[PDB]
């Protein structure tokens, strides 16, 4: 039970404080189940994003091991190119020795300039790690730093502290009832199959089944543009002048639950979770984004879903466990 507390940021972002080098240099990084590479800004970067973020200084670490190779990571928004190095990472109380990670040299754009974290700490499979860089959890397990090849995530609601990522352990106080195990279909992202999404007993979208990735890195409940449009109209969300899917706050008390059936079991998501409240206005937590993969269009169970269920990422068996949070 090694725990890494996370800082809840406006319910839109979750990141933690890790250290690199020795003495440990600290950086805030998103714990992202949607990626597998670990990288932080380095002193070799001068992009806008790098002027206001913690930059790793290889020179101050007696344990750094440089290499010839470079990494180039392209994210949903914003990128980062740089080299790859070896050092000791301090994540969740663990001394992750010989952890290769990426050092940024360039971070084009201003997105990351606005982002409240320096880098990203990926937790998906190695198969999607740019340049074959071994993920942190894979490196941790490979050298026996954790007793179990699995980790669990609890994400607190509306800014509350308590968000954690527990490596090699499951803590039963974070959920109520029993855990149900969903097998991973495509090992890259934490991809599973969703049997149907119903509302009031009717399949409003994804009625033939579809693929969804569990992503602590995406803040909303994302889906293909067309089916999501039906969902929006079912929840009373219309686009305002500002291109925003707004619902009237007086509707929250009256909206039914949207239910996702994952492997024979129903996981409802109440209107209090899918209708976010941003400054006296209510904006829905569904966003369209067509993301074709060989297995088709992907839906993303982001923070909106994850906040409702204690998730266990089982790498030993390649399945995710879900249970209602307490």
CSV table of N, CA, C and O in Angstrom, one decimal, residues 143-211:
chain,number,residue,atom,x,y,z
A,143,UNK,N,11.5,-4.5,-11.0
A,143,UNK,CA,12.5,-4.6,-10.0
A,143,UNK,C,12.0,-4.9,-8.6
A,143,UNK,O,12.6,-4.7,-7.6
A,144,UNK,N,10.7,-5.4,-8.5
A,144,UNK,CA,10.1,-5.8,-7.3
A,144,UNK,C,9.9,-4.8,-6.2
A,144,UNK,O,10.1,-5.1,-5.0
A,145,UNK,N,9.5,-3.5,-6.6
A,145,UNK,CA,9.3,-2.5,-5.6
A,145,UNK,C,7.9,-2.6,-5.0
A,145,UNK,O,7.6,-2.0,-4.0
A,146,UNK,N,7.0,-3.3,-5.7
A,146,UNK,CA,5.6,-3.4,-5.2
A,146,UNK,C,5.3,-4.9,-5.2
A,146,UNK,O,5.7,-5.6,-6.0
A,147,UNK,N,4.5,-5.2,-4.2
A,147,UNK,CA,4.0,-6.6,-4.0
A,147,UNK,C,3.0,-7.1,-5.1
A,147,UNK,O,2.9,-8.3,-5.3
A,148,UNK,N,2.3,-6.2,-5.7
A,148,UNK,CA,1.3,-6.5,-6.6
A,148,UNK,C,1.4,-5.7,-7.9
A,148,UNK,O,1.6,-4.5,-7.9
A,149,UNK,N,1.2,-6.4,-9.0
A,149,UNK,CA,1.2,-5.8,-10.4
A,149,UNK,C,-0.1,-5.1,-10.7
A,149,UNK,O,-0.8,-5.5,-11.6
A,150,UNK,N,-0.5,-4.2,-9.8
A,150,UNK,CA,-1.8,-3.5,-10.0
A,150,UNK,C,-1.8,-2.3,-9.1
A,150,UNK,O,-1.0,-2.2,-8.2
A,151,UNK,N,-2.6,-1.3,-9.5
A,151,UNK,CA,-2.7,0.0,-8.7
A,151,UNK,C,-4.1,0.4,-8.8
A,151,UNK,O,-4.8,0.0,-9.7
A,152,UNK,N,-4.5,1.2,-7.8
A,152,UNK,CA,-5.9,1.7,-7.8
A,152,UNK,C,-6.0,3.2,-7.7
A,152,UNK,O,-5.1,3.9,-7.1
A,153,UNK,N,-7.1,3.8,-8.2
A,153,UNK,CA,-7.2,5.2,-8.1
A,153,UNK,C,-8.5,5.7,-7.5
A,153,UNK,O,-9.6,5.2,-7.9
A,154,UNK,N,-8.5,6.7,-6.7
A,154,UNK,CA,-9.6,7.3,-6.1
A,154,UNK,C,-9.5,8.8,-6.3
A,154,UNK,O,-8.5,9.4,-5.9
A,155,UNK,N,-10.5,9.3,-7.0
A,155,UNK,CA,-10.5,10.8,-7.3
A,155,UNK,C,-11.6,11.5,-6.6
A,155,UNK,O,-12.8,11.3,-6.9
A,156,UNK,N,-11.3,12.4,-5.7
A,156,UNK,CA,-12.2,13.1,-4.9
A,156,UNK,C,-13.1,14.0,-5.7
A,156,UNK,O,-12.7,14.4,-6.8
A,157,UNK,N,-14.2,14.4,-5.2
A,157,UNK,CA,-15.1,15.4,-5.8
A,157,UNK,C,-15.0,16.8,-5.5
A,157,UNK,O,-14.6,17.2,-4.4
A,158,UNK,N,-15.4,17.7,-6.4
A,158,UNK,CA,-15.3,19.1,-6.3
A,158,UNK,C,-14.2,19.7,-5.4
A,158,UNK,O,-14.5,20.2,-4.3
A,159,UNK,N,-13.0,19.5,-5.8
A,159,UNK,CA,-11.8,20.0,-5.1
A,159,UNK,C,-11.3,19.5,-3.8
A,159,UNK,O,-10.2,19.8,-3.4
A,160,UNK,N,-12.1,18.5,-3.2
A,160,UNK,CA,-11.7,17.9,-2.0
A,160,UNK,C,-10.4,17.2,-2.1
A,160,UNK,O,-10.0,16.8,-3.2
A,161,UNK,N,-9.6,17.2,-1.0
A,161,UNK,CA,-8.3,16.5,-1.0
A,161,UNK,C,-8.6,15.0,-0.6
A,161,UNK,O,-9.6,14.7,-0.1
A,162,UNK,N,-7.7,14.1,-0.9
A,162,UNK,CA,-7.9,12.7,-0.6
A,162,UNK,C,-7.7,11.9,-1.9
A,162,UNK,O,-7.7,10.7,-1.8
A,163,UNK,N,-7.6,12.5,-3.0
A,163,UNK,CA,-7.4,11.8,-4.3
A,163,UNK,C,-6.1,11.0,-4.1
A,163,UNK,O,-5.1,11.6,-3.6
A,164,UNK,N,-6.0,9.8,-4.5
A,164,UNK,CA,-4.8,9.0,-4.3
A,164,UNK,C,-4.7,8.0,-5.4
A,164,UNK,O,-5.6,7.7,-6.2
A,165,UNK,N,-3.5,7.5,-5.6
A,165,UNK,CA,-3.1,6.4,-6.5
A,165,UNK,C,-2.4,5.5,-5.5
A,165,UNK,O,-1.5,6.0,-4.8
A,166,UNK,N,-2.8,4.3,-5.4
A,166,UNK,CA,-2.2,3.4,-4.5
A,166,UNK,C,-1.5,2.3,-5.4
A,166,UNK,O,-2.2,1.6,-6.1
A,167,UNK,N,-0.2,2.2,-5.3
A,167,UNK,CA,0.5,1.3,-6.0
A,167,UNK,C,0.6,-0.1,-5.4
A,167,UNK,O,0.8,-0.2,-4.2
A,168,UNK,N,0.3,-1.2,-6.2
A,168,UNK,CA,0.4,-2.5,-5.7
A,168,UNK,C,-0.5,-2.8,-4.5
A,168,UNK,O,-0.1,-3.5,-3.5
A,169,UNK,N,-1.7,-2.2,-4.5
A,169,UNK,CA,-2.6,-2.4,-3.4
A,169,UNK,C,-4.0,-1.9,-3.7
A,169,UNK,O,-4.2,-1.1,-4.6
A,170,UNK,N,-4.9,-2.3,-2.9
A,170,UNK,CA,-6.3,-1.9,-3.0
A,170,UNK,C,-6.7,-1.6,-1.6
A,170,UNK,O,-6.3,-2.3,-0.7
A,171,UNK,N,-7.4,-0.5,-1.4
A,171,UNK,CA,-7.9,-0.2,-0.1
A,171,UNK,C,-9.4,-0.1,-0.1
A,171,UNK,O,-10.0,0.7,-0.7
A,172,UNK,N,-10.0,-1.1,0.6
A,172,UNK,CA,-11.4,-1.3,0.7
A,172,UNK,C,-12.2,-0.2,1.4
A,172,UNK,O,-13.5,-0.2,1.3
A,173,UNK,N,-11.6,0.8,2.0
A,173,UNK,CA,-12.3,1.9,2.6
A,173,UNK,C,-12.7,3.0,1.6
A,173,UNK,O,-13.5,3.9,1.8
A,174,UNK,N,-12.1,2.9,0.4
A,174,UNK,CA,-12.4,3.8,-0.7
A,174,UNK,C,-13.6,3.5,-1.6
A,174,UNK,O,-13.9,4.3,-2.4
A,175,UNK,N,-14.2,2.4,-1.3
A,175,UNK,CA,-15.4,2.0,-2.0
A,175,UNK,C,-16.4,1.2,-1.2
A,175,UNK,O,-16.0,0.8,-0.1
A,176,UNK,N,-17.6,1.0,-1.6
A,176,UNK,CA,-18.6,0.3,-0.9
A,176,UNK,C,-19.0,-1.0,-1.7
A,176,UNK,O,-18.9,-0.9,-3.0
A,177,UNK,N,-19.3,-2.1,-1.1
A,177,UNK,CA,-19.7,-3.2,-1.8
A,177,UNK,C,-18.6,-4.1,-2.4
A,177,UNK,O,-17.4,-4.0,-2.0
A,178,UNK,N,-18.9,-4.8,-3.5
A,178,UNK,CA,-18.0,-5.7,-4.2
A,178,UNK,C,-17.4,-5.1,-5.5
A,178,UNK,O,-18.0,-4.3,-6.1
A,179,UNK,N,-16.2,-5.5,-5.8
A,179,UNK,CA,-15.5,-5.1,-7.0
A,179,UNK,C,-15.9,-6.0,-8.2
A,179,UNK,O,-15.9,-7.2,-8.0
A,180,UNK,N,-16.2,-5.5,-9.4
A,180,UNK,CA,-16.5,-6.3,-10.5
A,180,UNK,C,-15.3,-6.1,-11.5
A,180,UNK,O,-14.8,-5.0,-11.7
A,181,UNK,N,-14.9,-7.2,-12.1
A,181,UNK,CA,-13.7,-7.1,-13.0
A,181,UNK,C,-14.1,-7.2,-14.5
A,181,UNK,O,-14.8,-8.1,-14.9
A,182,UNK,N,-13.5,-6.2,-15.2
A,182,UNK,CA,-13.8,-6.0,-16.6
A,182,UNK,C,-12.4,-6.4,-17.3
A,182,UNK,O,-11.4,-5.8,-17.0
A,183,UNK,N,-12.5,-7.3,-18.3
A,183,UNK,CA,-11.2,-7.6,-19.0
A,183,UNK,C,-10.8,-6.5,-20.0
A,183,UNK,O,-11.7,-5.8,-20.5
A,184,UNK,N,-9.5,-6.4,-20.2
A,184,UNK,CA,-9.0,-5.4,-21.1
A,184,UNK,C,-9.0,-6.1,-22.5
A,184,UNK,O,-8.7,-7.3,-22.6
A,185,UNK,N,-9.6,-5.4,-23.5
A,185,UNK,CA,-9.7,-5.9,-24.8
A,185,UNK,C,-8.4,-5.6,-25.6
A,185,UNK,O,-7.7,-6.6,-26.0
A,186,UNK,N,-8.0,-4.4,-25.8
A,186,UNK,CA,-6.8,-4.0,-26.5
A,186,UNK,C,-5.8,-3.4,-25.5
A,186,UNK,O,-6.1,-2.4,-24.9
A,187,UNK,N,-4.7,-4.2,-25.3
A,187,UNK,CA,-3.7,-3.7,-24.3
A,187,UNK,C,-2.8,-2.6,-24.9
A,187,UNK,O,-1.9,-2.9,-25.7
A,188,UNK,N,-3.1,-1.4,-24.5
A,188,UNK,CA,-2.4,-0.2,-25.0
A,188,UNK,C,-2.9,0.8,-24.0
A,188,UNK,O,-2.2,1.1,-23.0
A,189,UNK,N,-4.1,1.2,-24.2
A,189,UNK,CA,-4.8,2.0,-23.2
A,189,UNK,C,-5.5,1.0,-22.3
A,189,UNK,O,-5.4,-0.2,-22.5
A,190,UNK,N,-6.2,1.5,-21.3
A,190,UNK,CA,-7.0,0.6,-20.5
A,190,UNK,C,-8.3,0.6,-21.2
A,190,UNK,O,-9.1,1.4,-21.0
A,191,UNK,N,-8.4,-0.3,-22.3
A,191,UNK,CA,-9.6,-0.4,-23.1
A,191,UNK,C,-10.5,-1.6,-22.7
A,191,UNK,O,-10.0,-2.7,-22.5
A,192,UNK,N,-11.8,-1.3,-22.6
A,192,UNK,CA,-12.7,-2.3,-22.2
A,192,UNK,C,-13.9,-2.2,-23.2
A,192,UNK,O,-14.0,-1.3,-24.0
A,193,UNK,N,-14.9,-3.1,-23.0
A,193,UNK,CA,-16.1,-3.0,-23.9
A,193,UNK,C,-17.3,-2.5,-23.1
A,193,UNK,O,-17.5,-2.9,-21.9
A,194,UNK,N,-18.1,-1.6,-23.7
A,194,UNK,CA,-19.3,-1.1,-23.0
A,194,UNK,C,-20.4,-1.7,-23.7
A,194,UNK,O,-20.5,-1.6,-25.0
A,195,UNK,N,-21.3,-2.4,-23.0
A,195,UNK,CA,-22.4,-3.1,-23.7
A,195,UNK,C,-23.5,-2.2,-24.2
A,195,UNK,O,-24.2,-2.6,-25.2
A,196,UNK,N,-23.7,-1.1,-23.6
A,196,UNK,CA,-24.8,-0.2,-24.0
A,196,UNK,C,-24.9,0.9,-23.0
A,196,UNK,O,-24.4,0.7,-21.9
A,197,UNK,N,-25.4,2.0,-23.4
A,197,UNK,CA,-25.5,3.2,-22.6
A,197,UNK,C,-27.0,3.4,-22.7
A,197,UNK,O,-27.5,3.6,-23.8
A,198,UNK,N,-27.7,3.3,-21.5
A,198,UNK,CA,-29.1,3.5,-21.5
A,198,UNK,C,-29.5,4.6,-20.7
A,198,UNK,O,-28.7,5.1,-19.9
A,199,UNK,N,-30.8,5.0,-20.9
A,199,UNK,CA,-31.4,6.1,-20.1
A,199,UNK,C,-32.8,5.7,-20.0
A,199,UNK,O,-33.5,5.5,-21.1
A,200,UNK,N,-33.4,5.6,-18.8
A,200,UNK,CA,-34.7,5.2,-18.6
A,200,UNK,C,-35.0,3.9,-19.2
A,200,UNK,O,-36.1,3.6,-19.7
A,201,UNK,N,-34.0,3.0,-19.3
A,201,UNK,CA,-34.2,1.7,-19.9
A,201,UNK,C,-34.0,1.6,-21.4
A,201,UNK,O,-34.0,0.5,-22.0
A,202,UNK,N,-33.8,2.7,-22.1
A,202,UNK,CA,-33.6,2.8,-23.5
A,202,UNK,C,-32.1,3.0,-23.9
A,202,UNK,O,-31.4,3.9,-23.4
A,203,UNK,N,-31.7,2.2,-24.9
A,203,UNK,CA,-30.3,2.3,-25.4
A,203,UNK,C,-30.2,3.6,-26.2
A,203,UNK,O,-30.7,3.7,-27.4
A,204,UNK,N,-29.7,4.7,-25.6
A,204,UNK,CA,-29.7,6.0,-26.2
A,204,UNK,C,-28.4,6.2,-27.1
A,204,UNK,O,-28.4,7.1,-27.9
A,205,UNK,N,-27.5,5.3,-26.9
A,205,UNK,CA,-26.2,5.4,-27.7
A,205,UNK,C,-25.5,4.1,-27.4
A,205,UNK,O,-25.8,3.4,-26.4
A,206,UNK,N,-24.5,3.8,-28.2
A,206,UNK,CA,-23.7,2.6,-28.1
A,206,UNK,C,-24.5,1.3,-27.8
A,206,UNK,O,-24.2,0.5,-26.9
A,207,UNK,N,-25.6,1.1,-28.6
A,207,UNK,CA,-26.5,-0.1,-28.4
A,207,UNK,C,-25.9,-1.4,-28.9
A,207,UNK,O,-26.5,-2.4,-28.6
A,208,UNK,N,-24.9,-1.4,-29.7
A,208,UNK,CA,-24.3,-2.6,-30.3
A,208,UNK,C,-23.0,-3.0,-29.6
A,208,UNK,O,-22.5,-4.1,-29.8
A,209,UNK,N,-22.6,-2.1,-28.6
A,209,UNK,CA,-21.4,-2.4,-27.9
A,209,UNK,C,-20.4,-1.4,-28.5
A,209,UNK,O,-20.6,-0.9,-29.6
A,210,UNK,N,-19.4,-1.0,-27.7
A,210,UNK,CA,-18.3,-0.1,-28.2
A,210,UNK,C,-17.2,-0.2,-27.3
A,210,UNK,O,-17.2,-0.8,-26.2
A,211,UNK,N,-16.1,0.4,-27.7
A,211,UNK,CA,-14.8,0.4,-26.9
A,211,UNK,C,-14.7,1.8,-26.2
A,211,UNK,O,-15.0,2.8,-26.7
